[PDB]
């Protein structure tokens, strides 16, 4: 939970990324290499390591999904694991249906349908993201973790569709 404490923030999903940046930079200055240029190698190294820690904490807290995954790790969840899969079986089937549709859109080379598909997936990502935030606020950790896993699946679907768009018509 130290990542939050480091930035003097409460362990919650809601936070000011703007205020987070100013504090991250304040901390970062403390470990600027010039401050230890005249020091031993162990000193210069330690500064590098502390700098690394500050950056790991900042990256984790700044990223919406990483921030949620971190918060959940403080409550017995390891979203990094693989043996722990999505419990919402309907969601798995939904993702396969949507992917089969994307393949059809590709075969038809339909730009308008692809644009629509992309926006619809992005909208669902935003809606499920809102649901996760609500679940974290409600402190229903199990539910929040499953939604977080769903968001990871949706993000990949979204990125795959956007990659297709940059090609679609084929020359």
- Domains, in order of start, for the chain: 1-79 (1.10.287.110), 80-171 (1.20.1280.20)
Q: Are 13 and 136 in contact (CB under 8 A)?
A: yes
Resolution stated for this PDB structure, in Å: 1.8
Q: Are 37 and 94 in contact (CB under 8 A)?
A: no
Phi-psi region of 77 (alpha: psi -120 to 50; beta: other; left: phi over 0): beta
Report CA-CA distances (Å) from 14 to 54, 69, 129, 130, 137.
20, 13, 13, 12, 9
Residue of 150, 131, 140, 160 lying closest to 90 (CA atoms): 150
Helix pair 89-108, 141-165: axis angle to 10 deg: 10
CA separation for the pair 160, 123 (Å, rounded):
16
Q: Which two tokens stand for residue 33?
A: 């290499």
Residue 171's CB is within 10 A of a number of other CB atoms, namely 3
Experimental method, per PDB record = X-ray
Q: Which two tokens stand for residue 3?
A: 């990542």
Q: Are 71 and 13 in contact (CB under 8 A)?
A: yes
Q: Are 114 and 105 in contact (CB under 8 A)?
A: yes
CA separation for the pair 110, 119 (Å, rounded):
15
Helix (H, G, I), strand (E, B) or coil at 37: coil
What residue spans of the chain are helical by DSSP H? Answer: 2-6, 17-30, 41-62, 64-73, 89-108, 111-137, 141-165
């Amino acid at each position: 939970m130290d990542y939050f404490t480091l930035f003097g923030l409460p362990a919650r999903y809601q936070l000011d990324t703007q205020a987070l940046s100013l504090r991250f930079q304040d901390l970062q200055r403390q470990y600027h290499p010039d401050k230890f240029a005249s020091g031993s190698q162990a000193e210069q190294l330690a500064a590098v390591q502390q700098s690394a820690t500050i950056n790991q904490a900042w990256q984790t807290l700044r990223h919406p999904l990483m921030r949620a995954e971190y918060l959940l790790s403080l409550h017995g969840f390891d979203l990094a694991s693989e043996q722990h899969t999505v419990r919402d079986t309907a969601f798995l089937m939904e993702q396969l249906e949507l992917r089969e549709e994307l393949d059809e859109i590709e075969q038809a080379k339909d730009e308008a349908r692809l644009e629509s598909f992309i926006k619809r997936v992005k909208k669902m990502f935003d809606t499920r993201h809102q649901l996760m935030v609500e679940q974290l606020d409600n402190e229903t950790w199990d539910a929040a973790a499953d939604t977080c896993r769903k968001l990871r699946f949706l993000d990949k679907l979204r990125s795959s569709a956007e990659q297709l768009e940059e090609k679609l018509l084929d020359f």
